[PDB]
Structures are given as structure tokens and as C-alpha cells.
Design a protein around this ligand. Sequence first.
Ligand code: HG
Ligand code: HG
Ligand code: HG
Ligand code: HG
Ligand code: HG
Ligand code: HG
Ligand code: HG
Ligand code: HG
Ligand code: HG
Lengths: 190, 190, 198, 189, 189, 191, 198, 196, 190
Amino acid sequence: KIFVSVYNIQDETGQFKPYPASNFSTAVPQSATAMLVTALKDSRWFIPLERQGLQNLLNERKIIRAAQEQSLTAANIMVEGSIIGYESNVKSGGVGARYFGIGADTQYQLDQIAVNLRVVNVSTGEILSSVNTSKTILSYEVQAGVFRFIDRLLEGEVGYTSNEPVMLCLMSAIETGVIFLINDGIDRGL
Amino acid sequence: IFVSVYNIQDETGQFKPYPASNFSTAVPQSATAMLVTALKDSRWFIPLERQGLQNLLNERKIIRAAQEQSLTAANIMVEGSIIGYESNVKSGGVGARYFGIGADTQYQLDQIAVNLRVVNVSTGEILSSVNTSKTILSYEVQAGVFRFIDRLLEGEVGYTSNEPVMLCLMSAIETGVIFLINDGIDRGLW
Amino acid sequence: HLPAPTGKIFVSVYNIQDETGQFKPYPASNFSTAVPQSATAMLVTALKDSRWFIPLERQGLQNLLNERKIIRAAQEQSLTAANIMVEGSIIGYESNVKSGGVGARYFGIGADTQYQLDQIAVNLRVVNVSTGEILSSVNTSKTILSYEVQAGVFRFIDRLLEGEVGYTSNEPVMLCLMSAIETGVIFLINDGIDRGLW
Amino acid sequence: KIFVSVYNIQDETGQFKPYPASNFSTAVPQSATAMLVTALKDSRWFIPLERQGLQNLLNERKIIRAAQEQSLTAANIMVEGSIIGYESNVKSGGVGARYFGIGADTQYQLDQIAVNLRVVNVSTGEILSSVNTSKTILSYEVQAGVFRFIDRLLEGEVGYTSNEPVMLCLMSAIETGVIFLINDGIDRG
Amino acid sequence: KIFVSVYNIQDETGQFKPYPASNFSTAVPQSATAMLVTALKDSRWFIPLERQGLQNLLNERKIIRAAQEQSLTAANIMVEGSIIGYESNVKSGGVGARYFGIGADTQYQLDQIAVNLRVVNVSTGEILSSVNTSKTILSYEVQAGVFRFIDRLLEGEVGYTSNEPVMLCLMSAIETGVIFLINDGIDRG
Amino acid sequence: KIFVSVYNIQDETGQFKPYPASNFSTAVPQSATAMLVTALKDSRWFIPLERQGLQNLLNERKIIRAAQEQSLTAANIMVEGSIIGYESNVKSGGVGARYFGIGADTQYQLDQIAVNLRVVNVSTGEILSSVNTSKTILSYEVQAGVFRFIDRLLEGEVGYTSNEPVMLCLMSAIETGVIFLINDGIDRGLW
Amino acid sequence: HLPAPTGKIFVSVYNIQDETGQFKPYPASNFSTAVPQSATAMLVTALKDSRWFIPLERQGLQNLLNERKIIRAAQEQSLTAANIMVEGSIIGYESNVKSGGVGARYFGIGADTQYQLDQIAVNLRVVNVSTGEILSSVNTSKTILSYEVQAGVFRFIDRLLEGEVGYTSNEPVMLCLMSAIETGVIFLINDGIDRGLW
Amino acid sequence: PAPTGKIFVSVYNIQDETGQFKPYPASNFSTAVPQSATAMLVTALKDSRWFIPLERQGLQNLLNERKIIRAAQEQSLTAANIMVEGSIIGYESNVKSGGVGARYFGIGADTQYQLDQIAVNLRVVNVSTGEILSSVNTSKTILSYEVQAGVFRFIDRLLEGEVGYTSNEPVMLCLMSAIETGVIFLINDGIDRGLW
Amino acid sequence: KIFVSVYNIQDETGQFKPYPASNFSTAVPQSATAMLVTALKDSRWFIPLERQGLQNLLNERKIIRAAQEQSLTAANIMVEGSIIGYESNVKSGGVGARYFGIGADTQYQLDQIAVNLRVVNVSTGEILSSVNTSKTILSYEVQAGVFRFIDRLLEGEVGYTSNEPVMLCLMSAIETGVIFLINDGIDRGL
Ligand SMILES: [Hg+2]
Ligand SMILES: [Hg+2]
Ligand SMILES: [Hg+2]
Ligand SMILES: [Hg+2]
Ligand SMILES: [Hg+2]
Ligand SMILES: [Hg+2]
Ligand SMILES: [Hg+2]
Ligand SMILES: [Hg+2]
Ligand SMILES: [Hg+2]
């Protein structure tokens, strides 16, 4: 098992959800340095060293130094990087048709999440490896309806919409980004 | 065991869309209450406070002064954050109208994920981490009648329900603690 | 069997901050909180009316502390502590949760009604001072009822006639909190019953 | 007469007037710890100690003291607390009817102010008492009108609208707010 | 004459102009401690002591002290307080009528300004008195016009509008409070 | 000549222009201590001591001091005060009339501005005088038009709109206050 | 009679800041000033091109002062001052002030024209360094014209015909300030001529 | 071109100097360009190896960690002889943009396109003397287009249909491309300098 | 070759794009002190001293010095100055005409950018020279269309819109600005 100290990985996309959505609400989740901290632990052997998060674990330790009137492991590597980019439509499209009296239609869009991960050495400060990874996000809407006349009248509508959970594919993106960093480490091999 | 939780912050970076005020977070910031109570009510666990600590510390200074008796710590620590939130994710609905009775039904789903990490104090290594995700159901149903006599007759009835997003977080923050202890079964640290 | 406490206990309640992170929607200004920040008043009056408890204040500490700088200076005499602490926060607020309504119209009389319910949760914690352990904590959750009722008449003569009546009531969210926090201290005291700590 | 040191009572309702009014404009005045003070002054026995406001007086004291090259009274109690809350519509309603060609109608809304005061002992710093007093605020609108045809035409409208002064409705709130605190000192004493 | 040191009186109304007017524009002038400092000056016997403003006079005095290589007058009372509250409609209304073809109508609104003024002693730091005075702000609009057909057509419009100067009424409000503060010192005396 | 130091006079009107205007744009200029300082100097006798502005003058005198390895005149009085208020419509209104087919109309509004200037003694810190002055601001719009038929058609339009320079009536106010500030001093005299 | 200067004068101008407090209206972003902040460039170029005068910098002072720190380090030589000082501000901006336009249409040819005038004001003070007294001050004010003309044709055939032409010009406000500030330096120099200070 | 050799490159920050934000509907707070430089840049130099990026993103976290190591014992840190700096110079659109379309009864069809421009400033600056060795401004372009085709027809009954496709190039990627050629060019200027 | 220390040139025009564009987006890039620096570099002889940018190199020098348990060049001049102005429409206009059934039209807007550069001596701290150079920025639109009836119907549309890349056009301005600053240094000559 190798000790990895990862402090923080910030959303650098600078991108925000469009109207009607709140202009304050980021279009990308800040869950990185959790998603990352777990995905290393799930890739075990790796033993995430916390430091999220350190000043809390530091406050606690004062108390244990106090209550008694015992050391703290470091990592010989470190991981870093950030969320690179997000946008849409990227590549997007759709079709639809209506005849008397039945209409139907379907639309879809893609998005692109990118993540930069870099394994950096602790002692020498040299960046041992860095990779940029990008996944894509699907969304689609489907509708069908009938307008028919009798004399009287008749109509009907059905629809289904699916939007891939941006949080989830970041994870996949930030997962695969872990997979890479390992390959980079194996031929080293450290 | 004695457990000290410091903070779990909303990392979702989301805010409720229009009509809602652009300042309203889409998810409640109340974790480190939800987590503190989920540990207590799942006892054995004994929360160490630390909300909040500076208050308790201010108070201990007062007692000391008028007197002119130590403070219990935790050997593990719980951390993590709210990973993500969104909607519609998967969503949809149907409806139909005949002369003159119409009726229709719609539904939305949301998701929320949380990251809960037990980390050792003494050596500061992360003992375990979990990402748990719940979903949030919303729905609306309506029925109505438009009919003529000659004069007229019409009627409408409807019911709308949104799952209490705060309470799904409770559900979500709960099921993580269960798992976190289950890893603690084979750990054991006990 | 039988329970029993002993005597009064001193409680220091510093702050309960609103964690709901919520603000009324439009037409209301985005700056108006959807929930009052008034807890640690409601909680405090709860404790003083629910005596035997002597809230130690500390709202509020600094103002008293400067005031003690004053008195001491005019003369050229100690300050009571608390044995426990109440803490915790407003867990969250929202709507519509459950909500709905009905209505119907015939010629020419129409009528309708609607209602919404809001869910508030509150978390209160009693934590010991000396050893700093949390003695107990409780999550309590109210709902908030609002409703509207309307009736009207559109009728022709030839000439015309119409009429409208309506009533709208929203339960004062402030009070639900006042009520939420009321049920929260009831509970907390019951564990102190079996405790006692008194 | 007792010396009361009254520092701050802050608006905790966190409420702001809705559209059309500016989103920065509070739904309730911030003026308490004045209204509270004028209550205490005109409610004697009491002698409000200032401390608003303090540094202004504290600075001024340096000037006198310097120009001379003589002490400052205390208060045995402290009055504190906040504005618990505000809201509307709470309860509201109204009616109206129109016949050819005279219509007439009326509406009303009720608003709610709550106030928390607390008397805390200075010497030991224990809370002596606390009071939550909530008044209500009436608003109403009255209208009458006529649309009449001749051929030629005629119409008329008269209307009157009123909202109570929430500034004032707080004054009554804070006035009875003081009453109960005096009483808890009647039985204390 | 009595020396009155007066530092600052803040607008506490928490009130802002509605739409279309800028949401950053106060509903009430920030002019106090001018309107107050001129009021006392015209109310003589009085000698307002500045302190607006003190730091400019304080910097300036370094310059006089440094140019030489002589004392500073203090006051035994102090005036304080704030602008308590503002709002409208309060009382409001209007009427109008239109016949073929002459129309006419008129409307009015009232606004409410309140002021807290306290006289406090500087030596012992006790509030000597405090007063809450209030005035109202009248606005009105009058319109009349003619729409008539001939065959061709004819129309005409006249209108007049007036809004009372909220800045003026505050002066009016901040004035009477001074009249009040004087009395309470007379029977004292 | 008298030495008069004036530090700063701020816009206290608390007012901002309505829509369409940028909500950030102050309805009244922050130009006081420019208009004021010159109204004292242009109406001389008086000798403005700067202090706008003093922080810079003091940085400069550091530079003189450094290259050499000599005093600074003061004022016996000080002027102060600020911009009291601005508003509308105050008094306002207008007329218009149209016949077939020629229309014409005119509209007018007034605004008010007040300014507070106070002469304060330096040595004792007494206020030697205080004055509130008020100007008013005129805005008017005039139009005329013709809609007439032939059968084909005809129409025409003309219009003109004047808004008095709010910046200027601040100046106009800031002078007349200084004018009055001098008069009261003639019976003081302090001059 | 007869006037005369003697030699070049050293001027330090630190800041002349926009005091207009004016912002462009809609459709502009609320954030865009209606006047450039470029004074203390405009002033300085005016003084360098209207030389004899020697702008002393001090914009800017820290960049130069941080740079002198470097040289003095790299070697291990004095700094010229100014004898006068130029100050003052941008006193204001506005519109519409005086504005207007006309137009007419007949079948089917229309035409129209509109125009606005703006007013900028600038205050420039010369204040002596050694004694701190203000030697002189000016308020200068330019105007800024904007105009628009358009003409068109709506005609029928049966088929159809129409046409549109138009031209709009808005004076470069930035420049009027440069013009406003120019006239302000000329006046000042004049009084200096009869002073002389030279 | 070539390695040798390895050169230590310590790159600190390259910040977006375009000062540009997305239009309506998208939030007025959202940048029209990534903040990802000094990631995009650091990985550029590394895949153009030989270069040995020295981190310093990022230095503070590596610094606390070194306090941890040093404390757990109660051992040096490599420097770089050159440095890269600079910024993302500018962004905009329409710049060059256009489109066409035509409809006959009852088939319509149409297409539109827009171009965007991204500029990057990279600089190689010497450490020892603190002198600029080089600076280069490289710019890419970003394509967007929309294609649609549709049918409105009558029978009596009726018929309609619509098909469409839209593509907007990833401004993230173009900047990654810009910064890439930006590095390429920077090599050549060192290729003839040389310092390498 | 003369050593030139170039620090900062800030946008003083205070301009921001109109609606629909965000109210936060400047009408002019902030990238000068790059555009100026590369100008000097390519107008060489000039040896720009960095100082963008200084503190990163300064922090870097703490590392090398300390890695060992070698001096830092000056400049005798300084380039300073600012972006004087930006605006529009300045001059703008356009025409168009339509006959049955062919229409067409064309439009144009011109923008003005101004720049102030200044050379200032270090040793005595005098401004040696200052230049104001102002370019313009061209924007034009072209449309043509056809509406014709048959019975049946026909229509067509073609268009082209170009605005000049103000970023480039700032370089154009900032370049010619160096000409005059070099030129006044010809007769200086320093
Ligand atoms: Hg995905
Ligand atoms: Hg749930
Ligand atoms: Hg309730
Ligand atoms: Hg009332
Ligand atoms: Hg009045
Ligand atoms: Hg005027
Ligand atoms: Hg001009
Ligand atoms: Hg690309
Ligand atoms: Hg250009």
C-alpha cells in the first residue's frame, strides 16, 4: 500500500447553470477531493491520508495532547489537479414528425466534463505524472401526442426525459483519471 | 465509541431555480446535525460536539475565572460532505383528454449523494469512506371536465407532492453511517 | 416506579444558527429569509418559562461583558457559569412537500379552494460542559398550513351580474418554529427525567 | 427608578419587502433600542443608560478630560432580546359585487409582528426574564364604481386604501413588551 | 447658551425606493447631523460643537501644531437618535369620473416619517430625555381630458402632479423634536 | 485673505437614478470639494488649503525630503457640510391638445437640491455658521405632430427636450451658500 | 507691456479620479461607467505635449519604487521631486440636457432625424507643494453631440417596393474629456504667465 | 523536435486575462473561457518532454506535507532554471460568422455557422537573471454550426416534419490546442537560443 | 538593447458589454502587459524585464537559494500607461432595399480604442515620454433574401456578419504605440 496525501482539487471550469436556473449554482459539483479521495481508496492498494480537512484533525489532536496532561503519518507521493472544463451543446441534435393527427418527437444533447489529475512527488516536488481526461454527458426528451376531431374532440400526450447525472460521470471521469495515473506509475515503477 | 465530527459542508454547489430566490441553496446545510444525531441514535456512538466548539470553550473559560475539569477527546473522526444534487435526472408524465373530461399525471426525480469518511485520529489515515446516494420523488396529478349545456359546466381537481429533500438527506446521511459501522465490524477498531 | 429531579440547573445557550439556506421565492425579495433567525430567543424563552432552568444568556455575552467593564471602572463581582449547553440548528425548511386543491364551476356560480404545507425541522442538542460530551439531541419537525377559498358568480340578464368572495390564510411560520422548538425541549427534558444529571 | 443598560435589539425576522419595492428595503424598521428606550423613559420608574451610541460619548469624554489638562454611572440590569419575526399575508381576505352598472368591493390583509425582550441581571449575568409580544397589522382596500351606457356613456370610480404603519405597530408591540417585564419585577422584585 | 456635542444620527428606516427607481436609492435622506446641527444653531441659545467631521478638524490641528515648531472646547450634553421609520401608502386614495366625452380624475397618497431624538448627559452618561416625533408626506395627482367625435375627432389633456419633499418633511420632523427636547430641559431645569 | 481648509463634502442624498438608468449611477455628482473649493477660490478673498488630496501632497513632501540627504501652512477656519437631498417630481405637470389632424403637447418637471455648508472654527471647534441652500431643476419636453388623410396619406413630427444640468444647479447652490456664508461673517466679523 | 516664463517646471500629478458617479443606462451593463477613468494620463500627456512641463509620474509610483529597490539591491541614485501639484477631478457627466429631433413621412417616402447633447465637466487645481496652498483652479465643461438620420420608402405596385437608409454618429466621449482637460491646462498656464511662479 | 537531456520548468500561474463572460441565457457569472491553464499548460510541457514540470500549483499543499514529514522525524527540494508565464490573452465572437437557407413548398432547409477566437500568451523567462527569454502569442479558432431541414405540406389532413443537428466546438479544447502550439513555438525559440 | 521593466497597464475605460452579454464582461481585454511585452520583445532591441509576474519568480528564488544550504538584473527605463478608452457606436450606419420579391440590406458599426503608453526614467523618476494612439474596429452585416409567390410559394435567405477581433485590434493599437515611444527614444537617445 502506498500513502497518498491529497489536499484539494477545485472546480476550475468557472461555468454556471443557465436561465431559468440560479445564476449562483455551479454547473459542476465540488465533490472532488471526495470523489477522488474515495476512488483512490476503492482502487486499493491506496491509503488516502485525509488532509481535507487537516485543521479539524489538528484541533482534535490539541485536546488529546491536553487530556493527557501519538504521531502523524506522511505521504511520499501526492495527488493534485482540478476540474478542467464543462459546456454544451457540444454536439447535440434531434428530430420529430407529426401527421394527422398523431405527433411525435425526440431530442438529445451531449456535454463534456474534463478533469486534470497530477501525481507529484513530495520530497523532490517534481511532477511525476499528469493526465487530462474528458467524459461526456447525454440528455434526451421524447414526446408523443394525438389531436383528433369527431364533432366533440380528442387529444393525448405522453413524454419521457432523461438527463445524465453530471456528478456521476465526473466520478467516472475522475475514476478513469485514477486508472491512468496508475499506468504512469507502473513503468516507473516507484 | 467517542466520535468527533467537525464539519460537513454543502459541496453540491447548487441553488434552487426560478421561481425560487437565487440565494436559496437547493439542499439544506444542516449536516453536522443530521450526522451528529445519526451517530447518537445509532448508539453505541458518543458525539463530541465540535460545532460549536468555540462556544463550549468560551464557557469553560468563564467557569475558570469565577473560581479565581479537563476535556474528553475522540480517537476516531468522521468527515465528508454533500457530494451532489440535481434534477430532473430521469423525469416524465402522461395525460389524456376526451370530451369533455381531461386527466393528467407528471413526476420528477432528483438525486443526492453524500460522502462519509471515518478517519483515524492517532495516525490520521482514512479508515473508510462511503458515497451514498438517495433519490427524491415528486409528482402531480390532475383531473377536469369542460362541458356545454345552453350555460356551461366545468371542474378541476389536483394533488401535488414533493419529497422533503431535507428528509431524503436524512435518509442518505443515515444509510452511510450504517455502512461505516459495518466496515467497522470487520475492522474492527473494537 | 417513580421519577424525580433535584433542583434548578444552569444552561448556557449561545447560538442556534439557521442552516436551512432558504429564501422566499418571487414576488418576495431574494434577500428575505424563508425562515426567521429568531431561535436562541424562542429557545431561551422556552427554557425560562419551562423552569426549573436558568438560562445563562450569552446572546449577548459581549454586551454584558462591556457593561461589566463599566461598573468595575466607576469603583476605582463574579460571573456565574452554566453546567450544560444547548446547541443545534434549524435543520431546514421547504414546500410544497405535500400540497393541493380543488374547484368547480356551474353557470354561473364557481367555487374553488387550495392548500399548501411546509416542512420545518429543528435540531436541538444538550451537551455537557465539564467533559464536553453531548448528553442528548433531538430532531423535531412541524408542517405549515396555508389555504385559499374563492366563490363567484357570472350571470347574464340583458345588464349583467357578478360576484366574488375569498379567504386566504397562511399559518405564521414563525410560530411553527416556536412550536417546533417547544416540542423539542419537552423531549430533551424527558431524557433528563431518566438521567437525571440533576 | 432603576438604571437599565440597553445596548442592542436586532431584527431577526430577516424579512424584506416584496416587489415592486426595492429588494434591499426591510419589512420592519431597525429603530428598536430607541423605541425600546423611549418606552423605558416614559415608563418610569426607569432611567435608560444610553450605551447606543457609547463610543460617541466615550470620545467626547476624552475631549473634556484633555481640556482639563468625572465618572460614569453603571446599570444593575440589562435589557436585551430581538425582533422575533414578521410576516404576511398570514390571515387575509375580502369580498365584492357588481350589478349593472354599479360595482363595489373591499379587501383586507393582516400582518404579524413579534418581539422578544429579556431582562438579564448584570452582577451574576443570569437571565432574569424574557417576553415575547406579538401584535398584528391591518391593511384594507375599499372601492366603488359605475359603468353606465346611454348612447353617450358614463363612468365613475371612488376608492380608499390603507395600511397600518408597521413602524407604529411595533411601537405598541414594544410598549406592551415592556409591561410584562415590569410585572415580572413586581413579583421578583 | 449651552454647548451641544452631536456626533451621528443614522437613517435606521431600512427603507428604499420602489421600482422603477434604483433599488440602491434610500427612501429617506441621510442628511441628519446637518438638519439637526442647523436646527440647534437656529434654535439658539445653542452652540453646536461640530464633531461631524471631528477627524478633519483633528488632522488640521496637527498642521497648526507642526507649524509652530490651542485647546479644544467640550460639551456637557449630547444629542443622539435616528430616523425611525418610513412607509406608504399608509393612508391613500382618490376618485375620478368620466362622462361623454370629458373625463377627469384625482389621486393622493400619504407617507410617514418618524424620528428618535435623545438628549443625553456627557458627565454621568445618563439619558436626560428621548422623543419620538413623526410627520407625514402628501402626494397628489390631478388629470382632466376631452375625447369627442365629430366626423375628424377631438381630444385634450391637462394634468398636474405634486409630491411633498421627503427631505423637507424630515427637516419638519427633525425640527419639532428640537422644540420637544428644549421643553424637557426647561422644567428640569 | 483668509486661509480656509476644506477636507471633504460627501453626497448624502442617498439617491440613485431610476430605470432605464444603471442602478449604480448616483443621481447626484460626488464633485463637491471641487465645486466647493473653487467657489471659495473663484469668489476670493479665500485661499483653499487643498487637503483633498492631502495624502498625495504628503507623499510628494517625502520625496523632497529624501533627495536632500519646509513647513505647511494651516487654516484658521474650516468649511464643511454636505449634499442634503435630491428628488422628484416635487411639483410637476403639463398639457397638450390635438385636433384633426394636428396634435401638440408639452410637459415639465422640477427637481429640488439642497446643500449644507458650515463654517467651523479650528481652534475651539465651535461651528461659526451653518447654512442650508436649495435650488430647483427644470425639465421640459415639447412636441407637435400632424396626422392627415388624402387617399396615400400624410404625417409629420417635431420635438424638443431640455433637462437642466443637475451638476450645474449643484454649483449654483454651492455658490449661493458661500455667498451667504460670507455675509454672516461680515457681522462676525472674524475677517 | 510684455510677459515671459523662464525655465521648465516639475509637475507631480498623483490622481484625478472620476467623481461623475454616472453609469451608462440600459442596454449597457450597469457596470460600465459613462466616463473613462483615463485622466492622469490625459492630464499627463497634455503636460508632456504642452511642454515645457515635466510629468514626474507617480501613478505608478510603486512600480517605479519597487524597481528602484531592485537596482539598489543588484549593486550590493536619488529621486527628483516636483515643485507644483496638479489635482482636481472629473466633476460630472449627463444627458439628455438639451436634445431633440424632427421627421416627416408622406406616401410613401419617410425621413427623420434625432440628436442628443451631453455635458462633461472637469476640475483642475494647481496647488503649490512647499506651502500646500492652492494657487489656482478651473472648472471646464464640454458638450457631446449624438445624431441619427433615416429615410425610407413604402410603395405599392401589385408586387411591392420598400427601402431604408440610415446614418448615426455618437461623438467619442473619451475625447471630449481630452478636449475638456486640454482647455483646462491652457487657462492655468495663462495665470501662471502673469504670476509668474517662473 | 528533440529531448536531450531534461529541463526543469517551474510554472506558477497562467490566468485568464480575457475578462469575458457568457451571454444570456447562461449565467452572467460564468466565464466564457476555462481557468484550466497551469494544468493545460503543465501537461503541455510534460507531453512535449523533455520537460520536468516542478509543480508549484499547489506549492502550499506540498509545503504543509513537508512540515508533516519533517515533524514525523521529530530532505531537499529541486529548483528550476527556467520558468514559463503568461496568460490567456483574449476571446470573442461573432468575429467571422454566417449562414444560409432556402425553402420551397413545402420543403425548407437551412444552415448557420459562427467562429470564435482564442488567444494565448506564453513566455519563457529566465530564473537566474530574471530576464524574459521569449514570449509568444498563439491563437486558435472555434467552429459552431446549426443545420435544419423541414417539411410543411397540406392534403385535406396535413403533414409536417423536422430534422436538425447542431455542433459547437469545445472552447476548452481549442485553448488546449492553442496552448499546445504555443508550447511548440516556444521550443523552437529555445531550439535556437539555446539555453537547452 | 536596453533593459525595460514593464509592470502593469490597466484598463481605464471602464467599459462592459451590453445586453445580451453578461454585465460582468469587459468590452476590452485586460491582456495588455502581455501585448505590450511581446510587442517590445518583437520590436527588439528591447529586453523586457518580466515583472508581470515578479513575485512568482521571487518565490521561486527562495527555493534555489535554500536548495543550496545569483543576482537579479535591473532596467534603466520603465514602460507604463493605460488603456485610455473604448466605445461605440462612434460612427455607424447602414442601408437596404427590397423589391418584389428580392430584398437585401447592409450595415456597419465602427468602434474606437485608445491607448496611452509612457516611458519613464528610473534613476531620476521622470516621465521621458507618453503616447496616445487610437485605432478603430470595423463591423459589417450583409443580408439578401427572396420572397416569391406561385400557387405554392418560395423564399430564400443569405447573410454574412463580421466584427473585427478587438483583442487583435488592441494589439494593432499597442504596436503602433511602441513605434512612437521608440521614436522619441531616437532623438533622446538614451
Ligand atoms: Hg455520464
Ligand atoms: Hg426521501
Ligand atoms: Hg404554526
Ligand atoms: Hg398597531
Ligand atoms: Hg412634511
Ligand atoms: Hg441649474
Ligand atoms: Hg468630442
Ligand atoms: Hg479546437
Ligand atoms: Hg483592428
